[PDB]
Structures are given as structure tokens and as C-alpha cells.
Design an enzyme around this catalytic site. Structure first.
Site, mmCIF file in Angstrom:
data_model
loop_
_atom_site.group_PDB
_atom_site.id
_atom_site.type_symbol
_atom_site.label_atom_id
_atom_site.label_comp_id
_atom_site.label_asym_id
_atom_site.label_seq_id
_atom_site.Cartn_x
_atom_site.Cartn_y
_atom_site.Cartn_z
ATOM 1 N N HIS A 224 0.826 -1.204 0.000
ATOM 2 C CA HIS A 224 0.000 0.000 0.000
ATOM 3 C C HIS A 224 0.860 1.254 0.000
ATOM 4 C CE1 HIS A 224 -2.565 3.233 1.466
ATOM 5 N NE2 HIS A 224 -3.621 2.505 1.153
ATOM 6 N N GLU A 228 1.070 3.705 -3.367
ATOM 7 C CA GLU A 228 0.578 5.075 -3.290
ATOM 8 C C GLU A 228 1.681 6.077 -3.609
ATOM 9 O OE1 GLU A 228 -2.482 6.200 -3.015
ATOM 10 O OE2 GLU A 228 -3.314 4.152 -2.932
ATOM 11 N N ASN A 232 1.897 8.928 -6.813
ATOM 12 C CA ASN A 232 2.172 10.349 -6.637
ATOM 13 C C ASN A 232 3.404 10.777 -7.417
ATOM 14 O OD1 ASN A 232 0.430 11.827 -4.403
ATOM 15 N ND2 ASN A 232 0.606 9.661 -3.841
#
Ligand code: A1EMR
Ligand code: A1EMR
Ligand code: K
Ligand code: K
Lengths: 372, 372
Positions: A224, A228, A232
């Protein structure tokens, strides 16, 4: 009635476990009776502690249909758990019924994180940002989501062991998880920007050079975080260099030290001024209505949810951290810190007490320095 | 008497100035009367605010000969300034006597920072670390040294203008200051380790590409920061690679963004675990007896003073910052953040009030989270 039950168990403090304790439990012994004895107290305690803080939310947030639904899920799970308070660990049906109840609660709570996020959307839609309460909302959501992570951990472990040690991998291959996160982020990046940056991966096992880098960890937690971060980094890279049409790679350096496992991810996506970094971890600033179902248009990579603050909570849950530092105009580094030793990896849990209550009922301002 | 004078002026808050205000003053008008009117109030206010906090120090620190000397310097300067409270700005001798007094105070206070540091040495020598008071010592020294930086700034400006705009350079050539810090750190590095790392310098003027990078700044403040960082980076590099005999360069990347001037300095000196980073900014941990005069042996590069926490105070004094992030086993980055715009560069000043007093008389603990 129900407020009396919540008050009884919220008096207690959550009891943090180390990663080693999680691991040592389900490895050899794997006693379902032992898990029962622990969880029939610990789950009510953790549910009731966070439920006291749900009640302190601004009324317009508490009253949203999504927060009301989450609260009703917690109330129902608490009541179902309390039915075992006086039942015997030797009662085999009681053990069986408890494991069944853990599984039921796990499924009932599968959607807690996005439903809570839906309540913030509902709150923001109908009443706007309130600067007085918004500090309380940020404080609550960090604690509510960290609490949820810890409750999810307990439910998953018991469900997997009695329905790799649970969701813990004693030999988590860090670089394989990282490549997995890269490839899934790259797939979404190609779908949105019709191109994507390459990956440059470097590793250093300072502890034992040339040896593979493994730690005791929950792989989905690591996935996770890196997934993520990749989204970005890719978003910034693709938008900053859209004019050039040449996209610099995303660089990842993994290091295993005597104490720290660190993952550093670097982009050349143009950076962010220091003044604007912290809003990336702010739930209210990050709250926007979610992408609609009824479209074929690709989903945006970042800026459309709580991926980043929840990633940092995952890191901090076992005494790690996740830090961002950017050079405005050039690019950004993100660093994941994880404890290399399982005995240092202890749950970080919020606790409801006078101190917590005071946070909701006080103004927090630095009056000992002059106003900038 | 003297306590009455301190109490009168400590009631007021320091009045922060922007870099633009500093600059606009001494550029064209350069009115010595105007500086008088401001400083005859502002200097007593800033002296008296910090003097109230000297009095809250642990008695064994307050009573050291070095702290007693610093306090007596402040008391004497305050009394000399208060003699102008009722004198007229048109009285030309009063203006002349005031500028003379500013110069006298500036010289009297030339050694405040090392004398205060000597008091911490005396305190630590005779009573050891006290965990209750040591939080107060850290709080005080940040504020005392930031206060001193701001008072030094006012004295220097008035002394230079009435004894480049004062010590401010409207066109500070960032890369030239950086090279200056590198060469002086390298000289000390060669003297201690008989070798030193090379410098690799990169710059990006995102604001105006290819143009030189300049800002309005105090060059000696920037020099102090980069010089101290270079010494730390070099020490780590030389000690970590002493076995190899090959020393990786120190890399510096300078970026001018729309809002931030950033200087990133990177070493491959083996890093520091996250748990141990903050003690690098802790005065009590950094306090050791100073190098003796009576030796020809080279002076160690780092770990022997307050260069690092004072560097961060310089950055924060004008709303910048200085951050460290390390990968244990690999190396360390330091990032200086400076405001690119003079109108954003406002003094950051401590103020004595109930909030400040409360800090010295309270235990600061995070009771709303479980103990790790
Ligand atoms: C490892 N990379 C990485 C990780 C991560 F967790 C977040 C980011 C990131 N790279 C980023 N680049 C840019 C932004 C951003 O906030 N852009 C908006 C912005 C830019 N300029 C002026 N005002 C606003 C955010 C990230
Ligand atoms: C830009 N470079 C830079 C700037 C700076 F301001 C400080 C440092 C630095 N590089 C460093 N490398 C190492 C240390 C250190 O504390 N070493 C002791 C340590 C190491 N391993 C285990 N326990 C203790 C400190 C710095
Ligand atoms: K409690
Ligand atoms: K005051």
C-alpha cells in the site's frame, strides 16, 4: 445501556502487541483458546476507545449517513463481542461461535475506510470547511484510521489462523513487493497519461552485503505504501514534463541497516514548496467527491483520496514512519522507515482518556513565539 | 529595581521585522533618528523578554559562572539602553550617545554564544543530566540563541549603517557562498583526516533558467549553515570509508523555486538510524568540554559543539528551515530551505508570556497514545 457498555470498555487502554508476539503466536502453538481469551477483551476495548471519539465529532460530521452507518457497525460488533464476556474458554461451542463472530465482524467492517471517507465528503459538501472543527477532524481521522488498521490486524490474524503467519510474512522480500507496486502504478499511469516513467532500483544490504533484503512484515502494508508513493511520483513526473515528452525515471533506493529498513523514492516531477507539503497529509484538503462509476475515462493517479495519509499511518503503526521532502522546481523524495527488527515493531495505538478528550475541547496555538 | 525594569519591558512583545523592512530602511533614507526611535524600545523589549527566561533555568545551570556572566552582560546592556527612554530624538548628542552605546553593547556581547555554551558545560560537569530539567534546557537554548541572533541582527545593522545594506546582501550569490563553505570545511578536513571528499555542485534556476541564483539574505548566516553541514558530511564520509581509502564526493543541489530557495547536501557517509537523528539537535547531548588551546593536534570536524542546532536556528530565523534525513547504512541528506522572497522573510522571535512560563513548569508527554 449501549453507552454504559462503551464506557466500561473505553476505561481500559488498548494493549499493543509486537510483531514478534503476533508471529510467535500463530507459528507453533496456534492456540485458538488463547486467541479467544485475548480478543474477547481486546476487541471490545479497542472498539469502545475509538467509539468515544466518534461521539466527539462536529455534529454535522457525526450526523452524516456514512458516519452514522460506520458507528452502527461498531455498535453492533461491540454488542456481539460482549456476549462472550462470561462464557468459558473450555466451552468448545463458545470458541467456535467466537471465531464465527470474528469472521462476521471482519466482513461487516470490510468497507469502513471508504465509508468513513464518504462521510467526510458528505460533511464537506453540505457545510464547508470549519476552521475550528477541522483541527478536530484531522486529529480524529488519524486516530480512527490507525485504530481501524489495528482492529483489522487482529481480525485478519484470527480469521486466517482459525478460519506465512496470518497476514505476516516472516521473510518479506522487500524488492519484490516494490516491483509489484511499481508495475501496478505504471499500469494506471499508462492508462491516464499514455506513457509512464521507468523504474531504477538500487539496493544495499549493509547488514549482510549482497544478500537479499527481507524483514518480518505485513506485505500488503508495504505494498500500500509503495503503490501510493509511486502513483504520486508518476503523476508529478508526467504532468511536469508533459511539454518535453521525455519522462525521467523514478529512482528507488532500498537500504537495510542495523536498525532501519529504508525505502527512498525520488522523482523529478517539479517539487512542492515547503509551505504546501503538509496539506498532502490533511484529510479535509484531500477530500473530493469520488470518481463516478458510469465512465470509461481513466481514473486519475493521485490527489483523489486518502492514499498518502493512510500510507503514513501504516508506516507508523509498527513504529516506522513516512516522510516527504521536496525541492520546489526540481523534484521530491519520499522515505519509508520500517523497523528492521521484529522486537522493535510494536503496535502504535490511540487511547481514549482525559488527554484525548482535551484535544477535542481546546485551541492549539503557539503563543510563545511571535505570529509569522 | 532591576527586576522592575525587566518586568516592565518583558510585558511587551518583540516586534518582528521583515527582510524587506531591514533592507528598505538602510538603502535610501538611512535615518539614524528613525533607527534610534525604534531601537530604544525594541532592544530593551528583546533583552527583557529573554532575561525572564534566564531566571527560570534550573538553579545549578543559572548559578554557573558562565551563565551568571551572560546574565550580567544583559543586565548592564539593558540599563544602559534605558537611559535614553526619555531623551529627545532631536537631541543630536543623544543620537550620537545612543549609536555609541549600540556599538559598546555589540562588542560586550560578541562572545555570548560560546559563553552560554560554556555554562552548559559547567552545568553538565558538576550535576549530570537531569531528565526533568533537560527538557527545559533544550527549550531555553533554542529561544535564547534565536533571541541572540535577532538582537545581534539589530546591533549589526545599526552599527554598520551609522558607525550591501548593513549585513544584508540584496544580491547574495548563493553558489559562491556555498563554495566558500566547502573550501573552508575541506581545509579542516584535510588537516584532520589527511584527505577529503570532492564537491559536486548542481544548480537549477527554475524561476529563470540559466540565470545566476541570487536572493536577499545575510551571507554570514548562509555561510554558517553550509559550512557546518559540510563539516558533518565530511566527517561521516571520512570515517565511514576509512577502510576503503576512496572517498565519495559530497553532492550539493541548489534550486531556486517560485517560493523556496533550497540547498540539498548529500553524503555517502553511512547514515544514522531515525531514532538517533534528533539528538543531533539536542544541546545537552552535543555538550562536551571544548578542545584545549595547548596542542598542535588538529581540531575534530563535528560533534564538538552547537554548530548544527544553531545552523537550524539561522534557517528558521527568517521563516526557513533545516532538515535532516538519513538512510542508515548508506548516507544522509541535509536540506536548507530559505524564502526566495524578501517579503516572506520575517523574523521569528520568542516572546515571554504565560505560555512560555507554562513550558518551564509542566511535563510534556503524549498520553493520548500508547507507550511504545
Ligand atoms: C516520491 N514522490 C512523491 C511522493 C508523494 F507522496 C507525494 C508527491 C511526490 N512527488 C510530488 N510532486 C508534487 C506534489 C504536489 O503536491 N504537487 C502540487 C504542487 C506543486 N507545486 C506547487 N503547488 C503544488 C506531490 C508529490
Ligand atoms: C549532509 N550530511 C550531514 C549533515 C548533518 F547535519 C549531519 C550529518 C550528516 N551526515 C551524517 N552522518 C552521520 C551522522 C551521525 O550522527 N553519525 C553517528 C551515528 C551513525 N550511525 C549510528 N549511530 C550514530 C551525522 C550526520
Ligand atoms: K481508555
Ligand atoms: K512579553
Amino acid at each position: 445501556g449501549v453507552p454504559g457498555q462503551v464506557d466500561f470498555y473505553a476505561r481500559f487502554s488498548p494493549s499493543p502487541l509486537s510483531m514478534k508476539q503476533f508471529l510467535d503466536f500463530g507459528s507453533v502453538n496456534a492456540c485458538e483458546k488463547t486467541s479467544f481469551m485475548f480478543l474477547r477483551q481486546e476487541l471490545p476495548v479497542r472498539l469502545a476507545n475509538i467509539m468515544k471519539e466518534i461521539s466527539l465529532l462536529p455534529d454535522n460530521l457525526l450526523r452524516t449517513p456514512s458516519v452514522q452507518l460506520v458507528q452502527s457497525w461498531y455498535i453492533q460488533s461491540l454488542q456481539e463481542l460482549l456476549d462472550f464476556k462470561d462464557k468459558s474458554a473450555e466451552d468448545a461451542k463458545a470458541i467456535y461461535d467466537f471465531t464465527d463472530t470474528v469472521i462476521r465482524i471482519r466482513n461487516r467492517h470490510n468497507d469502513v475506510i471508504p465509508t468513513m471517507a464518504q462521510g467526510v465528503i458528505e460533511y464537506k459538501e453540505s457545510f464547508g470547511v470549519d476552521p475550528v472543527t477541522s483541527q478536530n477532524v484531522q486529529y480524529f481521522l488519524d486516530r480512527f484510521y490507525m485504530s481501524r488498521i489495528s482492529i483489522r490486524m487482529l481480525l485478519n490474524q484470527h480469521s486466517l489462523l482459525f478460519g506465512h503467519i496470518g497476514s505476516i510474512n516472516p521473510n518479506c522480500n522487500v524488492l519484490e513487493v516494490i516491483k509489484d507496486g511499481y508495475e501496478n502504478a505504471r499500469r494506471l499511469c499508462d492508462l491516464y497519461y499514455i506513457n509512464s516513467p521507468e523504474l531504477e532500483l538500487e539496493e544495499l544490504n549493509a547488514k549482510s552485503p549482497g544478500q537479499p533484503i527481507q524483514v518480518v512484515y505485513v506485505p500488503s502494508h508495504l505494498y500500500h505504501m509503495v503503490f501510493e508513493l509511486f502513483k504520486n511520483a508518476m503523476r508529478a513526473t508526467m504532468e511536469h514534463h508533459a511539454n518535453r515528452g521525455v519522462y525521467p525515471p523514478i529512482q528507488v533506493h532500498v537500504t537495510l541497516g542495523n536498525e532501519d529498513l529504508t525505502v527512498k523514492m525520488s522523482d523529478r516531477g517539479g517539487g512542492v514548496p515547503l509551505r504546501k507539503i503538509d496539506r498532502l497529509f490533511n484529510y479535509m484538503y484531500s477530500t473530493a467527491p469520488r470518481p463516478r462509476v458510469e465512465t470509461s475515462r481513466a481514473v486519475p493517479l493521485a490527489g483523489f483520496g486518502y492514499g498518502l495519509p493512510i500510507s503514513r499511518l501504516y508506516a507508523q503503526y509498527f513504529q516506522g514512519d513516512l516522510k516527504l521532502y521536496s525541492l520546489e522546481g526540481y523534484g521530491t523524495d519520499a522515505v519509508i522507515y520500517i523497523k528492521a527488527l521484529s522486537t522493535d515493531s510494536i503496535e502504535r495505538l490511540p487511547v481514549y482518556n482525559k488527554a484525548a478528550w482535551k484535544h477535542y475541547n481546546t485551541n492549539h496555538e503557539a503563543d510563545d513565539w511571535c505570529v509569522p
